[PDB]
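Aim 2, interim progress: modelling of the protoporphyrin IX containing FE-bound target.
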Amino acid sequence: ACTKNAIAQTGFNKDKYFNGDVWYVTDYLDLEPDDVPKRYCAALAAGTASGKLKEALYHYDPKTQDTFYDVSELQVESLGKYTANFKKVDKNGNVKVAVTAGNYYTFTVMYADDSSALIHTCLHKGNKDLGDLYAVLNRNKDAAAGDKVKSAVSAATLEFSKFISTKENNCAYDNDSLKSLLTK
Ligand code: HEM
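Predicted structure of the complex, ligand included:
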């Protein structure tokens, strides 16, 4: 179940966030913690491609090796808050599971600057959801969370100490695929 109406950053700069570059998840918190593994790897690219607002996602379970990519065109609900219907693709953008009604995520940018961000997502996959999932992002996959983003975690009435880091999982990413997938 998702339970939070995440508030988007006041003054969110959409063009900076959606600049075509990659964001790495460094830390995450699911309010239903058993919905996701204790060890995980994830990243995304976010950009406008031929006028269309896009995200490309990458998930990797470092223990099971379960791997998947997704592409979505985001619809705007308000500045910094989006609804994304996703398609599972291979790294080259070939469709494995087409877009469908019931497959979407919400995506709220709670805080962002040039290097760091805090997001909330609620994933819906038919009648399943994966809970309220918060993620700390950085442009540098190895960056420890700094004071701007940690303060934003506090401002959301969360505790950064409870987030799970992705940093000790040997995560290696294909940035080229993420960038190219924005067009797909
Ligand atoms: C920016 C952040 C994230 C977004 C927008 C997001 C989005 C999604 C989407 C769209 C799917 C469905 C993929 C498909 O079936 O095509 C998915 C699945 C999944 N995500 Fe995420 N995710 C994010 C971060 C994470 C993180 C950090 C974790 C783990 C800690 C995670 C764990 C999972 C798992 C385990 C699944 C598979 C669910 C299933 O097998 O049905 N995700 N996510």
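The chain is about 10% helix and 45% strand. The first strand starts at residue 19 and ends at 30.
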